């Protein structure tokens, strides 16, 4: 097996449009994901709230849908609870709260897209492992 | 002066590396055991037998490389290169695990050769062969662990694989499955190994700290002449020191050094016997009286019951990956787990 | 001579069957208290709530243990690192429930064993010996300090100190592997070389000196009767022993200096046990063994398991089952 | 004493030695480097390259499950990578 | 050869520095040159850290142990521990490194070129180890230098910008100390506190007032003792009590440094005042408490009543009592209830944690800090994989409290071994059997049999 | 009057020449990217 543009093609928006990533972006998103997100989201679980993982099936059922690049980029700017009812920038890192989460200050729009691509590509690679927790280590 | 006697003179020639008759067995087998481990840890996978990477070539480091055992479906086959499994194909031999039998079998005969080398050199110098006799314990350990143990089990798959963390896995398997810490034969082995290390450390330090002053320098090492007739330290002062510190002491130099042979040698032999038992799954796993009470009395808890729960966790959490030929499918909901973790 | 000087001469006297000394003045009462408390508690002590969760563990013989399963149970997790002498309890019954004997035993013992070490220096000064035997004892003493004191300090509770029992010790070792991967720690690997090599060299030295005993006895009597206590000459031939062993390997891998040989015997296991004690002591602060979990991945990104990942599956089984009622929250952070 | 060979200190310090071994040592090294760099080590020993562990959409390992049909199984696995 | 060989000095090469024992000039050079290596390392390592430093990540995610020491002193940091200006770190680094070159110059000069011994070049700098008066006088000088040093820390705190105060209201800030504690009942009460849980001996000091105060006491104590030892010579009882040799003095210092290394180990592991968690990451206890807080907050947000939730054992799932009744976090973290920290104390009332404050007064910054400290607990692997031993690779983190505590326990233990070694050897040498038993007068042979 | 070729010679070279060959192979492996 290898990293193909087929694996590297993820939903761009909720309207079924897609976008194809390069190898460089995928590894960039993994590098940046470790830098800013992995302390809580290692392997796709959420250490401070294990009830919510980063599985595509889970992101799909978030309000608004989060299983595409645009929805994931929007979450990284203005995060919400799972039903969309509350904004949580005060306790979840985002561009909107880059003052209190300083790791978010040096992130450009290009970086957030690479991060989302990683989140969306990785379960196509690891399968159940992504977001499964220690059962699948 | 036949050709036999002329060959004998050249073998027993006094050189930098002594050869002897025993060398004909020893040097080829030891070199190929050694060479086979180095070859297999450097270049050879375990993907088809185990589902694992195991070489530097694949990206493993010193602690994770291994010559892994062959697949369970090979049973106890000798896995000869010219045998019916590989049928001459060197590449297939490597993929099917033939290097494990290659290393195990050549190493077995290399150990035989090393012991004969001890007998051979002992006889030509004219000393008693107590060093050969002591080497029986490593041989007993190697034979019971790598040969007898898997011969009692379903295949070579379950013998140790030749690697650092592959051996650590073996340790934990033996805990989870055989409850080997509870076995009195292993406990005797532990006492002999820890007691041998103790005797090594206490004898060395006693000699170093009861030396006579035989030179004027601060480095006491230069004050020993291997032709001198006299004891280099004081046995009488060593004796009194331990008598008043610990209550008893050695008084006989010969008994002291025989005791240092005896203790670790007997330890390794005792642990060998317990492994022979584990070849048959003849474990000391349980105490029946404890299980009868524990089963009836939900408030009864000891460290023995606590350890079995740990063993049960090891078995279920490691078996699917550890024995892939079994196709264990354990759903989340049947994995034993405490609260929260 | 006044009474105080007479007393000092008796204390430091080299004519006592057992040397007392100034270290002995502390060592004797502290070891006696520890020993007497341990014997009574191992036979008779009631169950102890080690994990502070009102779930007592039976450790004593009278409460259904045998030699192999019996233990003096570590003190309650609710106590943590707090000092729990008898006089802090409302009753002996409360002190027993909460694991009081464990603190009493290990504090007196560590004090007495430290003075044991000191007492070894002292007598060697009175006899005119070189002083470094006590340095070799520092390796086992350091190891005892690691399991009973340092490791509880890092983790914040004497309830994670090593139990005083045969099965309790194995529990400690398993739980330790799950939480620190001690097998993958080079300081433990160094301890293993220390004691394997120690046992190896113990057997080597015993077998080589025994191989070269000088003929001093007939075939009926024991060869041990060839040595007479305090004789001036040696009873074996190190030249012959060197000659055998030099040829067994090669000439320069073999010692011919008795002093250099014996210092090697002392240095090897002591250094290795120093390291393994230092390993327990640094894992007390959660600097754990090498983590190669998912360290090899293929061109696509699939995890290619190694033997390290197999060890992790066993570790995960120990982790999730140990102290199965004591965790409410998903990470076991101490 | 001496068993009659030339002492080791004598050799490694001699000029003739390093004249011979300024070539052999680096040549063997480079030979070893080329054994891997050419990809030849993979085909001798049958070790997977990073792209030939799995097929593109398979998560099962090619475990050999038959004693006497074993060499035949590995060949079948190797041809489902292409 | 002027020593420099085993024949004339009686020491082998592997104990070659023992040749310098009675060569005061050559010994001076070793000490000054080695001092140069210490100042060199402090220099180069600060520059290394600065070169690698990214101000947007916490210090403790970056493997830094020296820049946190400079920030604690009030340089380079503003409110919350945020890095305002890195220039002071550069200055600290460059100045040490330049100094090491004049130290290194002086050491290499004294060891090679200068006089082998000093006793004929000047009776002031020369000395015999056995001169009880000269020995105490050098001690006295160095005591005075130490007490000055302690007073420098005071001057920074009181007159030259203040210190970083993690307890300062509003999340921590640099702050001038204007009322140091001088009451000896407090300053020395610390010394009489038990080292066990809930007391912590001197490791429990939790406010900068006590810290600055203690250094006024120590600074004046050292200056007094320095003068005392310059004008005095040891009394009779002290002379009969010690061994007076170069090696004994070394062994007393090895003992001292061992004890101090053990204390340091425990300071960095437990104390979050002079080792602010803003810079060093949370303490073990702190991380474990932060996890209980985190899930208390989450569940309470969902509608759980955290005060009445009974856990599986019958103890409270979120809250329980300590053995003396205080309300504390439940679960395994019950062992850590002695923890005190700026992010947690506002929820504390007279009986411990306050349910009313828990239900109503938890701010988002406390939820932020608790989540941050819980996911930066000081666990991790030797190859710097963060988390418990069973975690997968991903997070490249080991807490600096881990690095600092482990390295200094290892150092402290080896110096205890050194103390025993040189103390035993100094005793034996001064009695004259350090080289072995004398065959002609073996003492045991003149003693009665034990039995 | 020392020989150049001895049993000793054969012994040191049976080990040393594969050793260096293996070191070069392993060095090269450090540059394989997945
Ligand atoms: C000590 C001093 C030191 C000396 C060291 C010298 C090292 C020498 C190295 C020699 C190694 C010998 C390899 C023996 C291989 C072996 O045994 O291989 C095993 C085969 C038997 O084959 C096994 O047989 C099994 C049973 O099958 C049977 O059962 C099935 C249904 O039950 C079917 O019916 C099947 O057809 C039928 O054959 C399974 O098929 C296994 O997969 C298959 O491997 O026997 C055979 O080769 C021979 C069987 C005769 C035994 C020979 C004695 C040697 C072994 C003694 C160990 C006893 C230990 C027992 C545990 C304690
Ligand atoms: C001559 C010598 C003679 C000695 C005889 C008498 C010695 C008795 C001393 C006992 C030592 C063992 C008990 C220490 C255990 C312990 O809780 O020690 C740790 C204490 C720190 O205590 C902790 O101190 C903490 C202080 O933090 C508090 O205050 C902080 C303020 O920032 C934070 O707010 C924190 O949250 C808050 O809780 C809390 O009070 C904890 O509850 C409390 O446990 O350290 C200490 O007092 C510092 C000293 C540590 C002991 C050094 C260990 C030495 C081990 C020898 C090594 C083996 C030797 C080799 C063998 C050969
Ligand atoms: C580096 C620091 C240092 C060192 C190495 C010394 C070393 C010495 N001092 Mg000096 N001293 C110092 C700093 C130092 N001093 C300072 C700062 C002061 C000012 C307070 C003094 C005041 C001082 C006095 C007043 C005297 C000495 C004396 C001595 C000598 C005897 C040592 C002795 O008996 O130890 C101590 C060993 C003992 C057995 C004494 C009992 C100590 C007990 C067991 C320890 C517990 C009590 C402790 C002192 C305080 C409690 C601490 C607790 C709260 C934790 C020795 C050369 C004596 C001397 O000969 O004078 C010329 C003497 O009379 N010193
Ligand atoms: C001391 C030397 C020695 C020994 C004991 C072994 C032993 C072994 N090797 Mg190893 N091997 C050696 C040297 C040695 N090897 C060398 C130098 C090489 C390099 C080429 C190899 C390469 C090698 C490979 C590649 C393989 C082995 C394998 C084996 C095993 C199977 C052997 C077998 O069936 O032989 C069968 C042959 C005999 C038993 C010889 C029979 C002796 C004669 C013909 C009997 C007839 C005598 C006659 C009737 C009367 C004579 C009397 C006299 C007066 C003339 C066994 C463990 C196999 C293995 O490990 O499988 C996993 C394997 O695949 N070896
Ligand atoms: C940092 C540690 C340290 C220090 C400061 C010293 C210092 C000293 N040693 Mg020790 N030593 C050490 C470690 C150290 N040693 C270790 C680890 C070992 C074991 C291998 C020894 C073994 C040893 C022995 C066996 C002996 C000494 C001796 C000496 C003294 C004289 C050395 C001499 O003749 O140099 C002569 C060497 C040279 C002239 C070569 C060059 C040396 C210079 C200093 C190089 C420095 C270069 C450096 C880059 C500085 C340039 C920068 C510039 C700006 C200054 C000197 C005080 C000797 C002694 O006691 O004499 C009485 C002696 O016999 N030492
Ligand atoms: C008290 C001493 C101390 C402490 C606590 C640290 C701690 C740290 N250093 Mg530092 N360092 C030190 C001394 C110290 N260092 C010295 C003396 C040097 C000069 C060689 C350095 C040079 C240095 C560099 C160049 C780097 C660090 C880095 C680091 C971090 C990671 C270290 C690592 O992965 O270890 C790796 C573990 C080992 C190498 C194992 C060593 C175990 C030894 C060999 C056994 C002990 C032997 C002896 C008998 C005792 C960590 C915060 C790294 C970092 O993140 O920088 C920001 C980094 O790149 N340090
Ligand atoms: C503790 C360190 C120490 C000690 C005890 C000595 C002692 C000695 N040296 Mg050495 N030396 C040192 C460090 C040291 N030196 C350093 C660092 C250097 C490099 C700059 C030198 C370079 C050196 C040379 C080149 C020579 C000496 C000589 C001498 C002798 C006479 C010096 C004199 O009369 O000055 C008297 C005192 C003064 C003139 C006062 C100046 C001292 C400074 C400016 C005071 C500042 C102290 C400072 C504030 C403390 C903090 C510093 C640091 C902790 C941050 C004497 C044996 C001479 C000798 O033996 O003749 C052959 C000689 O030629 N030394
Ligand atoms: C104590 C630890 C000692 C370990 C050795 C250190 C020796 C060091 C020692 O004491 O003196 C060094 C020793 C003596 O060398 P020379 O006398 O040639 O050197 C002249 C010297 O006097 C000048 O320094 O050199 C060796 O023998 C080199 C060892 C390489 C040996 C290569 C042999 C390979 C043989 C094959 C493997 C053996 C098979 C064994 C049976 C299976
Ligand atoms: C700990 C402080 C966290 C950090 C660092 C990151 N995330 Fe997070 N995330 C965290 C929590 C506690 C939650 C649940 C929030 C809630 O109450 O609803 C989340 C949730 C998400 C989600 C939603 C997933 C879903 O199933 O709908 C996403 C997409 C997400 N987080 C992404 C994300 C990214 C990209 C991060 C790095 C920039 C990151 N998180 C860091 C906790 C924490
Ligand atoms: C005696 C002896 C010894 C020792 C010695 C010593 C120890 C020394 C030291 C020395 C030293 C101690 C040195 C030092 C030096 C220093 C230097 C030389 C520095 C310089 C600096 C600089 C030049 C800088 C620069 C810069 C800047 C300014 C800025 C930034 C950048 C940079 C960094 C570049 C030995 C052992 C060897 C041997 C024997 C004898
Ligand atoms: C700064 C500070 C502080 C303070 C401090 C202090 C004030 C200190 C003090 C200290 C001290 C005050 C110390 C002391 C010490 C002591 C010691 C350490 C001792 C020792 C001893 C010895 C060593 C002895 C011995 C002996 C004997 C016993 C017998 C005889 C012999 C001899 C002599 C040997 C505080 C904490 C508040 C806070 C923070 C900061
Ligand atoms: Cl448990
Ligand atoms: Cl918990
Ligand atoms: Fe001996």
* DSSP state letters, C112-175: HHHHHHHHHHHHHHHTT--STHHHHHHHHHHHHHIIIIIHHHHHT-GGGSPPEEHHHHHHHHHH
Q: Which helix (H) or strand (E) holds E319?
A: strand E319-321
CA quadruple D34, D38, D39, D41: dihedral sign: negative
Q: What is the CATH number of domain D8-80?
A: 1.20.5.860
Cα–Cα distances in angstroms (integers) from residue C138 to residues C111, C118, C156, E241, E247, in the given order: 13, 10, 25, 25, 21
Spell out the residues 6+ positions from residue E115 whose beta carbon is closer than 8 angstroms to its own: E25, E121
Residue nearest to atom 22 of ligand 3 (CA): E225
To the nearest whole Å, the CA of E415 is away from the closest chain C CA by 12
Q: How many CB atoms lie within 10 A of CB C302?
A: 19
In this structure, which long-range contacts are made by residues D30-34, counting pairs with CB atoms below 8 Å and at least 24 apart in sequence? D30/F24, D31/F21, D31/F24, D32/F20, D32/F21, D32/F22, D32/F23, D32/F24, D32/F25, D32/F26, D32/F27, D32/F28, D33/F24, D33/F25, D33/F27, D33/F28
DSSP 8-state class, residue C75: P
Q: Say which CATH number the domain at C228 has.
A: 1.20.85.10
**B75/D68 Cα distance (integer angstroms):** 11
How would you classify the pairing of strands E348-349 and C164-165? unpaired
C188 is in an annotated binding site: yes
**B219/E7 Cα distance (integer angstroms):** 11
Domain ranges of chain E: 4-281+378-451, 282-377
Cα–Cα distances in angstroms (integers) from residue F25 to residues B43, B47, B67, B70, D40, in the given order: 9, 21, 18, 25, 11
User: Given phi > 0 = left and psi -120 to 50 = alpha, else beta, which region is E307?
Assistant: alpha
Q: At what angle do helices B184-208 and C133-145 cross, to 10 degrees?
A: 140
**E30/E149 Cα distance (integer angstroms):** 23
Closest CA to B39 of B23, B24, B59, B54: B54
Give residue for tokens 């063993």: B311
For the CA of E153, the nearest ligand:
11
To the nearest whole Å, the CA of A1 is away from the closest chain D CA by 4
E308 lines ligand 3 (CB under 6 A): no
In this structure, which long-range contacts are made by residues A23-32, counting pairs with CB atoms below 8 Å and at least 24 apart in sequence? A25/A113, A25/A114, A25/A117, A26/A114, A26/A117, A26/A118, A26/A121, A28/A111, A28/A114, A29/A113, A29/A114, A29/A115, A29/A116, A29/A117, A29/A118, A29/A119, A29/A121, A30/A118, A30/A122, A32/A107, A32/A111, A32/A114, A32/A115, A32/A118
Instruction: Confirm if E255 and E305 have CB atoms less than 8 A apart.
Output: no
C-beta atoms of B73 and D41 within 8 A? no
Q: Which of E335, E408, E412 should one mutate to test binding to chain C, selecting the residue with the greatest count of C CBs within 10 A?
A: E335
φ and ψ of E16, to 5 deg: -70, -30
Question: Measured between CB atoms, which of C293, C301, C312 is closest to A125?
Answer: C301
Closest CA to E262 of E406, E135, E69, E82: E406
Cα–Cα distances in angstroms (integers) from residue C200 to residues B199, C194, C196, E296, in the given order: 11, 10, 6, 55
Query: In terms of residues, how long is chain E?
Result: 451
Q: Is B222 helix (H, G, I), strand (E, B) or coil?
A: helix
Instruction: Confirm if B211 and B205 have CB atoms less than 8 A apart.
Output: no
Which residue numbers of D have CB closer than 8 Å to B's CBs?
3-5, 36, 41-48, 53, 61-68, 70-71, 74, 77
Which pair of structure tokens corresponds to residue E357?
């404050």
Q: Which residues, listed in sequence order, are joined to residue A18 by a DSSP beta bridge?
A: A11
Instruction: Confirm if A17 and D70 have CB atoms less than 8 A apart.
Output: no
Spell out the residues 6+ positions from residue A31 whose beta carbon is closer than 8 angstroms to its own: none
DSSP 8-state class, residue B69: P
CA B56 to chain centre: 24
Contacts A33 to C, Cβ<8 Å: none
Let me know if chains A and D touch, i.e. at least 3 Cβ pairs under 8 angstroms. yes
Closest CA to E409 of C142, A5, A48, B51: C142
Which pair of structure tokens corresponds to residue C177?
């592997």
F12 lines ligand 8 (CB under 6 A): yes
C-beta atoms of E389 and C52 within 8 A? no
Instruction: Confirm if B244 and E450 have CB atoms less than 8 A apart.
Output: yes
CA B89 to chain centre: 32
| DSSP conformation letters of C205-218 | HHHHHHHTB---S-
**A64/A45 Cα distance (integer angstroms):** 20
Sheet containing strand E319-321, edge to edge, reads E319-321, E327-329, E352-353, E348-349
B106 lines ligand 4 (CB under 6 A): yes
Q: B218 CA to middle of ligand 5, Å?
A: 20
**E125/E148 Cα distance (integer angstroms):** 22
CA quadruple E361, E363, E366, E370: dihedral sign: positive
Closest CA to A39 of E52, E390, E377: E377
Instruction: Confirm if B110 and B33 have CB atoms less than 8 A apart.
Output: yes
Nearest-atom number in ligand 3 for the CA of E142 is 1
Instruction: Confirm if B69 and B100 have CB atoms less than 8 A apart.
Output: yes
Give the CA dihedral E154, E157, E158, E160, nearest 10 degrees.
110
Instruction: Confirm if E190 and E201 have CB atoms less than 8 A apart.
Output: yes
CA B267 to chain centre: 12
Let me know if chains D and E touch, i.e. at least 3 Cβ pairs under 8 angstroms. no
Nearest-atom number in ligand 11 for the CA of E202 is 36
Start-to-end C-alpha separation, chain E: 53
Q: Residue A64, preceding bond cis, omega within 30 degrees?
A: yes
**A35/E443 Cα distance (integer angstroms):** 70
**E230/E136 Cα distance (integer angstroms):** 6
* Alpha helices, DSSP H, located in chain B: 3-11, 20-43, 47-50, 90-96, 98-125, 130-134, 136-142, 149-152, 164-178, 184-208, 235-246, 253-279, 288-296, 303-322
Spell out the residues 6+ positions from residue E342 whose beta carbon is closer than 8 angstroms to its own: E166, E167, E171, E172
B185 lines ligand 4 (CB under 6 A): no
Contacts C184 to B, Cβ<8 Å: 63, 165, 168
Give residue for tokens 């000064």: C125
Q: Which residues, listed in sequence order, are joined to residue A80 by a DSSP beta bridge?
A: A87
**Closest B-chain CA to E443:** B237
**Burial (0-12, 13-18, 19+ Cβ within 10 Å), C39:** exposed
DSSP 8-state class, residue E129: T
**E376/B127 Cα distance (integer angstroms):** 64
Q: C251 CA to middle of ligand 8, Å?
A: 7
**B167/C193 Cα distance (integer angstroms):** 14
Spell out the residues 6+ positions from residue C99 whose beta carbon is closer than 8 angstroms to its own: C48, C49, C50, C73, C74, C75, C76, C79, C84, C158, C159
Closest CA to B315 of B183, B182, B174, B181: B174
Provide the domain limits for residue A125: 1-137
φ and ψ of E164, to 5 deg: -75, 125
Residue nearest to atom 37 of ligand 6 (CA): E382
**B37/C254 Cα distance (integer angstroms):** 27
Contacts B338 to E, Cβ<8 Å: none
CA B41 to chain centre: 19
Q: C5 CA to middle of ligand 11, Å?
A: 29
Give residue for tokens 């006044």: C2
**Burial (0-12, 13-18, 19+ Cβ within 10 Å), F13:** exposed
C-beta atoms of E451 and C17 within 8 A? yes
Question: Measured between CB atoms, which of A1, A4, A127 is closest to D55?
Answer: A1
Geometric angle at alpha carbon E367, from E366 and E373, rounded to 5°: 85
**A111/A103 Cα distance (integer angstroms):** 12
Q: At what angle do helices B253-279 and B184-208 cross, to 10 degrees?
A: 160
A63 lines ligand 9 (CB under 6 A): no
Cα–Cα distances in angstroms (integers) from residue C231 to residues C127, C217, C257, E369, E450, in the given order: 20, 16, 20, 75, 19
Spell out the residues 6+ positions from residue B74 whose beta carbon is closer than 8 angstroms to its own: B85, B96, B97, B155, B156, B157, D67, D70
Query: In terms of residues, how long is chain F?
Result: 34
Which pair of structure tokens corresponds to residue C265?
């015997």
**B117/B26 Cα distance (integer angstroms):** 8
Q: Hey, which bits of chain A come out as E strands?
A: 9-11, 18-20
Instruction: Confirm if E391 and C293 have CB atoms less than 8 A apart.
Output: yes
Which pair of structure tokens corresponds to residue D35?
């054994």
**E271/E246 Cα distance (integer angstroms):** 37
How would you classify the pairing of strands E380-381 and C287-288? parallel
Q: Is E387 helix (H, G, I), strand (E, B) or coil?
A: coil
Q: State the CATH architecture for E282-377.
A: Orthogonal Bundle (1.10)
Domain ranges of chain D: 8-80
Spell out the residues 6+ positions from residue E267 whose beta carbon is closer than 8 angstroms to its own: E203, E274, E275
Provide the domain limits for residue C191: 186-315
**C75/C107 Cα distance (integer angstroms):** 13
**E428/C134 Cα distance (integer angstroms):** 14
- Whether the CB of C316 is below 8 Å from some CB of chain A: the reply is yes
Closest CA to B121 of E62, C240, A33: C240
Instruction: Confirm if B109 and B25 have CB atoms less than 8 A apart.
Output: yes
Q: Which residues, listed in sequence order, are joined to residue C48 by a DSSP beta bridge?
A: C57
Q: Which helix (H) or strand (E) holds E321?
A: strand E319-321
For the CA of E121, the nearest ligand:
7
The number of distinct structural domains making up chain B is: 1
Q: Hey, which bits of E142-220 come out as E strands?
A: 163-165, 173-175
C-beta atoms of A1 and C300 within 8 A? yes
Instruction: Confirm if C312 and E385 have CB atoms less than 8 A apart.
Output: no
Q: Which helix (H) or strand (E) holds E380?
A: strand E380-381
Question: Measured between CB atoms, which of B197, B261, B307 is closest to C195?
Answer: B197
Q: Is E347 helix (H, G, I), strand (E, B) or coil?
A: helix
Q: How many CB atoms lie within 10 A of CB E170?
A: 8
Instruction: Confirm if B114 and B122 have CB atoms less than 8 A apart.
Output: no
DSSP 8-state class, residue E295: H
Which pair of structure tokens corresponds to residue A18?
């897609």
**B30/D67 Cα distance (integer angstroms):** 29
DSSP 8-state class, residue A101: S
CB-proximal residues (5 Å) to ion ligand 13:
C 327-329; E 331-332
**C44/C60 Cα distance (integer angstroms):** 6
C-beta atoms of A126 and C301 within 8 A? yes
* Alpha helices, DSSP H, located in E375-442: 400-431
In this structure, which long-range contacts are made by residues E321-329, counting pairs with CB atoms below 8 Å and at least 24 apart in sequence? E321/E352, E322/C78, E322/E352, E323/C78, E323/C79, E323/C82, E325/E351, E325/E352, E326/E351, E326/E352, E327/E351, E327/E352, E327/E353, E327/E354, E327/E355, E328/E352, E328/E353, E329/E289, E329/E292, E329/E293, E329/E296, E329/E353
Which pair of structure tokens corresponds to residue E130?
């056995």
Instruction: Confirm if C304 and C297 have CB atoms less than 8 A apart.
Output: yes
Q: Which helix (H) or strand (E) holds E328?
A: strand E327-329
């Amino acid at each position: 097996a290898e990293l193909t543009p087929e694996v590297l093609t993820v939903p761009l928006n909720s309207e079924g449009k897609t976008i194809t990533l390069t190898e460089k972006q995928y590894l960039e998103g993994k590098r940046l994901f470790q830098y800013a997100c992995a302390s809580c989201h290692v392997g796709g679980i959420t250490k401070t709230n294990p009830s919510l993982d980063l599985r595509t099936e889970t992101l799909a059922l978030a309000t608004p849908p989060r299983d595409n690049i645009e929805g994931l980029v929007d979450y990284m700017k203005n995060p919400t609870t799972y039903d969309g009812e509350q904004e949580i920038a005060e306790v979840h890192p985002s561009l909107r709260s880059a003052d209190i989460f300083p790791k978010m200050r040096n992130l450009t729009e290009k970086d957030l897209v690479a991060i989302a691509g990683h989140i969306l590509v990785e379960p196509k690679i690891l399968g159940d492992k992504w977001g499964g927790g220690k059962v699948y280590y | 002066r036949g050709w036999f006697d002329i060959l004998d003179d050249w073998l027993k020639r006094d050189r930098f590396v002594f050869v002897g008759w025993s060398g004909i067995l020893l040097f080829p087998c030891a070199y190929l055991a050694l060479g086979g481990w180095l070859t297999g840890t450097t270049f050879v996978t375990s993907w088809y037998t185990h589902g694992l990477a195991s070489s530097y070539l694949e990206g493993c480091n010193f602690l994770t490389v291994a010559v892994s055992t062959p697949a369970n479906s090979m049973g106890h086959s000798l896995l000869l290169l010219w045998g019916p499994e590989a049928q001459g194909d060197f590449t297939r031999w490597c993929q099917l695990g033939g290097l494990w039998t290659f290393i195990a079998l050549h190493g077995a005969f290399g150990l035989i050769g090393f012991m004969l080398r001890q007998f051979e050199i002992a006889r030509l110098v004219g000393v008693r062969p107590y060093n050969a006799i002591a080497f029986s314990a490593p041989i007993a350990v190697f034979v019971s662990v790598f040969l007898i143990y898997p011969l009692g089990q379903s295949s070579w798959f379950f013998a140790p694989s030749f690697g650092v963390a592959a051996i650590f896995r073996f340790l934990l398997f033996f805990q989870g499955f055989h409850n080997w810490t509870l076995n009195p034969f292993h406990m005797m082995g532990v006492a002999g190994v820890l007691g041998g290390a103790l005797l090594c450390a206490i004898h060395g330090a006693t000699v170093e700290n009861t030396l006579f002053q035989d030179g004027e320098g601060a480095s006491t090492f230069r004050a020993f002449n291997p032709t001198q007739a006299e004891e280099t330290y004081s046995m009488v002062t060593a004796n009194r020191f331990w008598s008043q510190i610990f209550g008893i002491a050695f008084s006989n130099k010969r008994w002291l050094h025989f005791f240092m042979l005896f203790v670790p040698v007997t330890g390794l032999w005792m642990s060998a016997i317990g492994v022979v038992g584990l070849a048959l799954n003849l474990r000391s796993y349980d105490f029946i009286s404890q299980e009868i009470r524990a089963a009836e009395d939900p408030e009864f808890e000891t460290f023995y019951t606590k350890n079995l729960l740990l063993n049960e966790g090891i078995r279920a959490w490691m078996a699917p990956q550890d024995q892939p030929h079994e196709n264990f499918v354990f759903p989340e909901e049947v994995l034993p787990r405490g609260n929260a973790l | 001579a006044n009474l105080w000087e007479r007393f000092c001469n008796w204390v430091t006297s080299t004519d006592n069957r057992l040397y007392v000394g100034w270290f002995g003045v502390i060592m004797i009462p502290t070891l006696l208290a520890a020993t007497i408390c341990f014997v009574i508690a191992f036979i008779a002590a009631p169950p102890v709530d080690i994990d502070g969760i009102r779930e007592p563990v039976s450790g004593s013989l009278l409460y259904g243990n045998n030699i192999i399963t019996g233990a003096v149970v570590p003190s309650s997790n609710a106590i943590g690192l707090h000092f729990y002498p008898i006089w802090e309890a409302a009753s002996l019954d409360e002190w027993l429930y909460n694991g009081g004997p464990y603190q009493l035993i290990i504090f007196h013992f560590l004090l007495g064993a430290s003075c044991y070490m000191g007492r070894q220096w002292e007598l060697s000064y009175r006899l005119g010996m070189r002083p470094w035997i006590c340095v070799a004892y520092s390796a086992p003493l350091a190891s005892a300090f690691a399991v009973f004191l340092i490791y509880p300090i890092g983790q914040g509770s004497f309830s994670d100190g090593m139990p005083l029992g045969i099965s309790g010790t194995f529990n400690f070792m398993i739980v330790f592997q799950a939480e620190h991967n001690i097998l993958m720690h080079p300081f433990h690997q160094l301890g293993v070389a220390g004691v394997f090599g120690g046992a190896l060299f113990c057997a080597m030295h015993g077998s080589l000196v025994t191989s070269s005993l000088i003929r001093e006895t007939t075939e009926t009597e024991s060869a041990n009767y060839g040595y007479k206590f305090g004789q001036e000459e040696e009873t074996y031939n190190i030249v012959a022993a060197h000659g055998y062993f030099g040829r067994l390997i090669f000439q320069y891998a073999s010692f011919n200096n008795s002093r250099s040989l014996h210092f090697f015997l002392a240095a090897w296991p002591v250094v290795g046990v120093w390291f393994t004690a230092l390993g327990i002591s640094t894992m007390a602060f959660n600097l754990n063994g090498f983590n190669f979990n998912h360290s090899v991945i293929d061109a696509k990104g699939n995890v290619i398991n190694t033997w390290a990942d197999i060890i992790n599956r066993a570790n995960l089984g120990m982790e999730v089952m140990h102290e199965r009622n004591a965790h409410n929250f998903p990470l076991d952070l101490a | 004493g001496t068993t009659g060979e030339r002492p080791f200190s004598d050799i490694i310090t001699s000029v003739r030695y390093w004249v011979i071994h300024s070539i052999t040592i680096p040549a063997l090294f480079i030979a070893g480097w080329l054994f891997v760099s050419t990809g030849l080590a993979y085909d001798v020993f049958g070790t997977p390259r990073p792209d030939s562990y799995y097929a593109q959409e398979q998560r099962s390992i090619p475990l050999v499950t038959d004693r006497f049909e074993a060499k035949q199984q590995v060949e079948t696995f190797l041809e489902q990578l292409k | 050869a002027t020593n420099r060989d085993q024949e004339s000095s009686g020491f082998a090469w592997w104990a070659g520095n023992a040749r310098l024992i009675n060569l005061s000039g050559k010994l001076l050079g070793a000490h000054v040159a080695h001092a140069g290596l210490i100042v060199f390392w402090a220099g180069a390592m600060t520059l290394f850290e600065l070169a690698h430093f990214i101000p947007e990540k916490p210090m403790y995610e970056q493997g830094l142990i020296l820049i946190p020491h400079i920030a604690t002193l009030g340089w380079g940091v503003g409110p919350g521990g945020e890095v305002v200006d890195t220039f002071p770190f550069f200055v600290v680094g460059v100045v040490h490194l330049i100094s090491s070159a004049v130290l290194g110059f002086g050491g290499v000069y004294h060891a090679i070129r200068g006089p082998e011994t000093l006793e004929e070049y000047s009776s002031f700098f020369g000395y015999d180890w056995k001169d009880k008066n000269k020995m105490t006088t050098i001690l006295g000088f160095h005591l005075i230098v130490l007490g000055i040093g302690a007073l420098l820390l005071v001057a920074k705190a009181m007159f030259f910008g203040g210190l970083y105060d993690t307890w300062a209201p509003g999340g921590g800030d640099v702050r001038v100390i204007t009322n140091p504690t001088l009451d000896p009942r407090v300053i020395f009460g610390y010394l009489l506190k038990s080292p066990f849980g809930g007391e912590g001996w001197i490791v429990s000091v939790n406010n900068l007032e006590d810290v600055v105060g203690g250094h006024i006491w120590i600074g004046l104590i050292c200056i007094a003792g320095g003068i005392w030892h310059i004008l005095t010579t040891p009394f009779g009882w002290a002379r009969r009590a010690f061994i007076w040799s170069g090696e004994a003095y070394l062994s007393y210092s090895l003992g001292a440094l061992s004890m101090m290394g053990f204390i340091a180990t425990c300071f960095v592991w437990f104390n979050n005042t002079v080792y602010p968690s803003e810079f060093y990451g949370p303490t073990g206890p702190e991380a474990s408490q932060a996890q209980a807080m985190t899930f208390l907050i989450r569940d309470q947000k969902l509608g759980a009543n955290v005060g009445s939730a009974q856990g599986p054992t019958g103890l409270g799932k979120y809250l329980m009592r300590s053995p003396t009744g205080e309300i504390i976090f439940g679960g395994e973290t019950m062992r850590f209830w002695d923890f005190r920290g700026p992010w947690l104390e506002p929820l504390r009332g007279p009986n411990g944690l306050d349910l009313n404050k828990i239900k109503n007064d938890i701010q988002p910054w406390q939820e932020r800090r608790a989540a941050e400290y819980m996911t930066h607990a000081p666990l991790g692997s030797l190859n710097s994989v963060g988390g418990v031993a069973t975690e997968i690779n991903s997070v490249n983190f080991v807490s600096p409290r881990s690095w600092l505590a482990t390295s200094h326990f290892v150092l402290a233990f080896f110096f205890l071994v050194g103390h025993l070694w040189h103390a035993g050897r100094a005793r034996a040498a001064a009695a004259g059997f350090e080289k072995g038993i004398d065959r002609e007068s073996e003492p045991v042979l003149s003693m009665p049999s034990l039995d | 009057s020392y020989p150049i070729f001895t049993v000793r010679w054969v012994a040191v070279h049976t080990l040393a020449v594969p050793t260096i060959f293996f070191l070069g192979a392993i060095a090269a492996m450090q540059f394989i990217q997945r």
